[PDB]
Amino acid sequence: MIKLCREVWIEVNLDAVKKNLRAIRRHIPHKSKIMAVVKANGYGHGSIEVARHALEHGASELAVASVEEGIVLRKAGITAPILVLGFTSLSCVKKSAAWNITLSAFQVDWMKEANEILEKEASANRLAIHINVDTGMGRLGVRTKEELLEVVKALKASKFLRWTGIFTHFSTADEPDTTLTKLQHEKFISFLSFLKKQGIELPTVHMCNTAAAIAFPEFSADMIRLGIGLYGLYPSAYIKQLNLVKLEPALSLKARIAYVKTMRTEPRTVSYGATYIAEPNEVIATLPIGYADGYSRALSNRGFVLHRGKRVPVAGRVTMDMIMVSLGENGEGKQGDEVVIYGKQKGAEISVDEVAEMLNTINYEVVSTLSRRIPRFYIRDGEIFK
Template identity: 30%
Template structure:
C-alpha cells in the first residue's frame, strides 16, 4: 500500500490494544467499556479504530452526532452506538433503521422525538442524560429533584424505549480539593436521582457516569458502563496519587524534508520577516503547516526531530510548509523523515508539549490533525490500512 509521503499520521493499533488492557484493569469486572470515537476517534480515524476496538472486545461506542454513528455502521461496526449530542427529531427513521441509541436531555426534546417516532411508525432506543453539574445539556439533577417528574413524563411517552441513564463529570481531572469535592457532589446527584426514579418504578438497564479521568481517579464508581475517550489514545491526564496507569500514544505524525538551503547572516525567513539569520545557517523546509493542523502558535518554541536530534522551527509557520534549523545536524538531506509528534531515538515530541506552547489541551490538537493528512494504520510492525480522506472524497 502506498500514499503520498508528504505529511502523514501513523496509528499504532498495538498501542491501542495495550491501552485497552491497562484501562480494563481499572474497571470492576461487571463494568463494560464504552469506546468514545467522536470527532473521527479524536483525529485517529473512526473506521479502523472502532473495528479494532470491537476486535478487542468492546461492544459499546459513543459518538457526537448522527453522521458519526452512520459512519461507524457503514464501516461495519455492529456494536451498540450512543449519540451523546443532539439529533433532529426528523431523523427518527435512521435512528431506528440503524439501531442507534439517542440521548434525551429534556422533556421538550423527548416530546418532539416521540411525536416524530409515532408519525413515522418506529421505536427509538434512548438514554436519559442528567446534568449533574456540567451545565451543558441534560435534565437538571440537583438537591431539588426538579428532574424527576420531567423524566417520568418523558419515560411514559410513546415509541421511546429508555434503556439507559447517564451523566458526565466536568472536573474529574481536577485533583485539587475543590475539584474532588465537586466531582463527588456530581456522583451524589446522579445516584440520588437514579434512586428517586427507581422508587417511582423507572428502571434502566444501563447506567454510566465515568469519563476517562473518572475511570482513573474514581475507581470506586461501580456502574454498567464507563465512557473512555482520550486515554484510549494514550494521551495522559492529571491523576490522584497512585491512580496513574502506563499508556502508549497511538498517533505519531511524520513528514519529510523537501529542500535544504544555506542562508546568510541577515537573510529573512518566512512571512512578516519573523526570523532573521544572525549567522550562516542550514535550513530544512518541511511540508506541514497550519492547514494540516500544525498551529502557527508553535513558531519560535516548537521543535521536531531530524536524524535523531531536535531541530527548532524558525520563522512563521505557513499554511503548508515551515522551516527548521538543521545547522548543527550533519547530513540532513531532502527526503529525510521528520518526526513532528512521536519518538525517535532518545528524543520525543508529544502533543502535550505542543499544547503547552499553544496554551491549549492535547485533546484539541489530536482533533485538529486535518483530513489532508493520511492515517496509516500499523499492527505488528506492518501497515494494515490507509485512510486518505482527500483521495477518497
C-alpha cells in the first residue's frame, strides 16, 4: 500500500467531501454560495487538497483563521476568494493586499489606518474586507446598528479598501432550544435593514455555519460557511438526529502494528505508571501513535482501536509517540497489520464522534488537533495520492 518509516497516517476521502458538498448544496437554496471553511489545516484534514477539491465541487470561496493559512493556499496556486475569520493586525495589511487576502474588520479606526498604510505604498490592488457583526457570539464584531453605520461609511470612504461581504456567527444553532438562534437571526436582518434604509447596498451576506445551514437553510442568504459538514461530520447529536442531510466522514486515521509479543515473563507491566499488568499468555501489540500526534492521553486504559475488524482496547498509558493494545489471550496479530484508530474496518467503526464522547469534547477538537507530523493521503475517484 504506502511506504513510511513511522507507520501512522491519515486518509482523507475527497469522494466523501464532494458528496457532502452536494448534499448541502441540494439542501440550501439554489442560488446560495458555499464558502468552504478550511481553517486550522482543513480542520486537520489538510487545507490545500481539501480546498482544491471543494472549489471544484461546489464551493466558491474559502475561509481560514489567519493570513498565514491564506498564503499557504495561494502558494498552492489557489486563486478563489480567501476570508480570514479572526483579527488581523495592522502589521499585515500590506502583506494581505499583496497576497489578495480578504480580511474581516469591524472598527472605524482599523479601517482608516488600513487605508493609510495602503495609500503610502500606492498599490492599485485594493484590500478586500468583510464586516463582522456580533449578534451574540460575543467574540469579534461590531454590536450596535449605529457603530455598524460608521464602520460601513469609513470602509466606503477608503478607496484602497473594497467591501465584499458582511456576516455574523450563530453561537447556538446546534442546540435543541432555538430561541437564541432566532433572536440572532432577527437582530442581524434588523441591522442589515437599517443599513438598507440609509441607502447602502449590501455585498455578500452570510450567517449559516453547518448547524444553521442544516436546521435553517432559509437563512443561507447569499452564502453559507460550511466547516464541520464539509468533513462529513455533524455539528451536534441534535443536528444529526434531525435526519435532514446525509454526511459522510472524510477522515480516517490508521497505523501498522510495530511489534507484537506474548507477555511470557515478568514483570508484565505495561507502559508508564505500570497501570496495566498483562496475563502470562496475554498478547500486546505496539502501535506508532501517541499523545503528541493528538491521540489523547485521557484515552489511557480507555480507548479502542480496530484490528482485523474487531475492537481491541488500549492497555496502560498512552505515551508521547506510542500506545499498546491487548489482542487478548494468545490473540493473533503480526507486525505490519493494519489498524484503524479513527474510522472503519470490515464492519467495525470507531468514529471521531465516539472518541469525542469518551473525552467529553466535540468532533471539531478530535480532528483539528491531529499533528502535522502524521502525513495525509487523499483518496479521489476511489484512488490514493500525495
